[PDB]
Amino acid sequence: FQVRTTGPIHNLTRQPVKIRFGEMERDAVIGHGTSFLMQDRLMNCSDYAQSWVCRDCGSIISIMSTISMNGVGSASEVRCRSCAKTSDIWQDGSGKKFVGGTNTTLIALPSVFNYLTAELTAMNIKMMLEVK
Amino acid sequence: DLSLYKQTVDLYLSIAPGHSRDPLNAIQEHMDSMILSKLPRINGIVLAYDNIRFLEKSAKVMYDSPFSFIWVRVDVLVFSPKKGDCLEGKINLVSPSHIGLLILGIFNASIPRKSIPKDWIFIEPDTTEEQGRWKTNDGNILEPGKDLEFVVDGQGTLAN
Amino acid sequence: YGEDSLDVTKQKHLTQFEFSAKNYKSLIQKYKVKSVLSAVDSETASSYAKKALKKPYKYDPVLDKYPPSRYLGSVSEKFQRAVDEYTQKNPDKLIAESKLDDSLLNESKFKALMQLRYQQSLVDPGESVGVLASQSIGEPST
Amino acid sequence: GKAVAKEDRTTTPYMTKYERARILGTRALQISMNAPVLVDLEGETDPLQIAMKELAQKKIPLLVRRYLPDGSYEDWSVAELI
Amino acid sequence: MNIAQPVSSEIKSVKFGIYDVDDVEKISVKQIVNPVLLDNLNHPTNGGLYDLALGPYLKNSVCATCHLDERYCPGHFGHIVLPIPAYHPLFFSQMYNLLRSTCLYCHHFKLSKVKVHLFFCRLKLLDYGLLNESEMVENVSLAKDAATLMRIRDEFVAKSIADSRQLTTLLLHERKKVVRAFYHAISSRKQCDNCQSFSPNFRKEGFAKIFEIPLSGKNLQFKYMTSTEVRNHLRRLFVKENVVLSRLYPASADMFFLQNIAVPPTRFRPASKMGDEVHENIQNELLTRILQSSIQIASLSKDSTVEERRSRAFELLINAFVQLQHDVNSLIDSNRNPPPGIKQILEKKEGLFRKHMMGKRVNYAARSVISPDPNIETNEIGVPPVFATKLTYPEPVTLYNFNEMRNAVINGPHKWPGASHIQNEDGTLISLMPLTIEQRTALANQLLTPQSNLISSPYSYSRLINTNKKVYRHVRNGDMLILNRQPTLHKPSMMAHKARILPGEKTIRMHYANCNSYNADFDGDEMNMHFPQSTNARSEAQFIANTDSQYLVPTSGDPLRGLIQDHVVMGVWLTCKDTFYTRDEYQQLLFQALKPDETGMY
């Protein structure tokens, strides 16, 4: 007997810490023809994230939030590093200036995929996921 | 110069679910927020928009949410001061650290003494310590001549 | 898909011709004839079906020429063979001769009901069926 | 891509067992987010069974796009389906 | 998940590929040069493996790069430099084979250029989906004459694509076979066909060491060292043979080796504080170890540039080289260097893609022992009021369910049918546990009213006025909550029952009919009980996958639900013809059977 409404999350993948739903539960749900129930119970309720993605360069890690643009003012308008080279320009935490890397949008992908991007880039092999 | 512009842009507007009877209301509802607010794609401040028409594609519903989405063609009127050429503004604040102007009554111009050559000298009046006339090398006073013309860096420049 | 009609769920009672013809008054209201006969084609595939039942070749199965979702005459060959062998063999329920028929039944009425049955009980398109076969092989193995 | 014309539509006129569930689900979500109800309520509270009452009378918006395997798609009004 | 989140992106495709030397430089924000991790002040060393611009450590340390706390900063990668570059541990086999087929004197492949051009025409024509056309190129039978043959083949392919123009499994099933044949072919030739000479072979090791003896004397008529020379050799091969390697993979410089590898932020690299012992992790341990070897190489190459002197110098240089190569190899692959590596935290069969991606632990899912009950329904599942209070789902508040939700928040999160807590339109969560009923009533009255203190509070994207206030409410007698049983073999094993909330017991109750479906015995096996949160999920569970619609197994038509032992024996005894009832028993037994009011509609 153990009922889990909400609780701690995982260090790396932001999963519920160690009930098990998958690899056979997925068979059942995509058997019933329940796309939305699968995408709910697996992606929504386990680990949900809104991660920024560079639309042009098509990658998810080389993005960075802009720093010290002005006073309180407006929103920190995120930009990209790998796609980069007064309004448009921006600095870094250490003070390095950049320009370019404007096409950045919101996508929704599970935190485990972000962890996979991490452990994958540590191997230098990286996926460039496109967005429309 | 001809620093005012109008550009017919196409945006991806999220029609809230509460306005699924008519889209126009939910379009205006977030268009009237963008006015006088920086639309960074075009790198300027939106001033005007009309001819609100949607490319009819039966606006699409997000795959788990009730608010729809659609591409809409609307024409903005951004003011672009991208160091094009000479502009002009009315002075409001003056100091021996920078000069303060308002162009179009709206947009600020902070011209530091760096971009000003030394030849112009500031007199410090006895009534106000900070506020005073920034006299030119010729000797002319600028407070009666509120209209000051210059060229832009991005910020202004009085050095030639 | 597998000679379409459906995986077992909606195909059990096709072989039960005695049962469908027994009452037949509830099945027409279950299929909602007045709404189905409107927008689907009825004459074309039904006409070509008989010509496909001509034993010589050069007339393909009705399912191949005419899709079964909208052409309400198109149905698998063995289904036609079986419904006709029942209608001719043991029609003790189906009345006839034909003059005494026009009170409550008609051979043509029943064959229309059965055509409508096959039509309304196709596989629901979009079904993921790979895992249906996967699980129908995993379950009885264990 | 192509948007197949209204004259020639090859998909099934039946509201498939899936389009019914998702139409009712999205209509329930819409009505739950303070959308207009197109049919008189009799006191039902759940923001879903209202959508069942709408669908029983075929008074519902939200045409569906059926994506054929070519890449093309049909546009079916929920009034138009059987 | 929230329903107000407006995400407009639609992830349309992923594409893999190597990340060159210039991109790992552009994406990186800081460099890690210092093998020291923590100083006496216990704060992270600057530029260190735990840099605050790398990833914000705990204890309210704001990221130096993004100036936002751990709640909002997605981590920023880093890079560590090495002018050694060692070859990649994965393509090491494929790199070594492509080297084996190299011609060092020829600077081409050992193959005949006409065969390489044949395979190039093949991989060109398979591009646009031409299978039999891919195989027809070979119906030609015939260096200058070989050059003419190459022109015949290329013009055949050009005309074929011209006729065709005006991915699928079969295309890929043919590409993979043709490339396997190509790689069987190029590894066969020992003598050059263009150079006619015999390039010096190379012999490998499992410990990542490669080289072999020089040319032989008869062929002259016609061991381990630095990886830099083989790197430049492969770069030369790649730049001189462009089209075939372009189709096969224009650029192939930094695929096989690595010049500056990246570090993940602290967010993915924690230190599990298991009681008192503090080991950072094997990952940061291995990164620190390669960092030590890197600085050792730096010092040693300095010593060598400033200088049997060359003998010992080169010996020690190559030994430090091989330590660095073997260390990177031990990092990315744990099957070498007799410490879990990246490939071994993936391929572990206990790691990713089976325990973290396909099957994830889930929120809002109870689990308990079942016990049988005949009184409820064939649909319904009894849940004690404990599961009533402990499973909640969000609900926007409208005009006609406002009474239900106000009353729910009044009852509170300790009394069924109370509600759990409120979610504002902007997105915060106002709890309801510590509040007192005066505060709860004051809050529940002002629950349906525009409370955002602006037309668009945070910024100028104005849907924050259209959203509703979401009360998390408890389950109630109509909510549809999935049941399951592991192992769940076939689809009738995971169904969705309506919940009916019983008082008293501490064991959920379901009817006997489902006992045949779940393959359960009510003897101690327990069942996961989920709750579909969003309304789309509960709608589809109610209409598509609800229990009463699972009357037919998928294998054969034969139905699986239906009554069991007691009901059927009493059936033989009730329908039997020697039975008789007076009026009282008839009416009473009938009404016990029907029980309309609990079901309704009549």
Place this chain on the structure above:
Amino acid sequence: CHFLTEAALRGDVDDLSNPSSRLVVGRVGNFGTGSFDIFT
């Protein structure tokens, strides 16, 4: 790792076909109720 290095060398692109690939990137499946897109 084997299928991974193979897909990394060649750099092969899926649209997003099967429910498993659709699941790893977090979108809904193409089967079932996720087959069509529903518009206003």
Place this chain on the structure above:
Amino acid sequence: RKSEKLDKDASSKFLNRYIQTIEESVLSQLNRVLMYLKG
């Protein structure tokens, strides 16, 4: 995402049209810029 060519007189006439179409601070500043550009 599109851009086109434009002259100043089109911009001013459209400023007029936008003063006309949707009817506090915003239109105040727009009258300010209208009074500054003309004259």
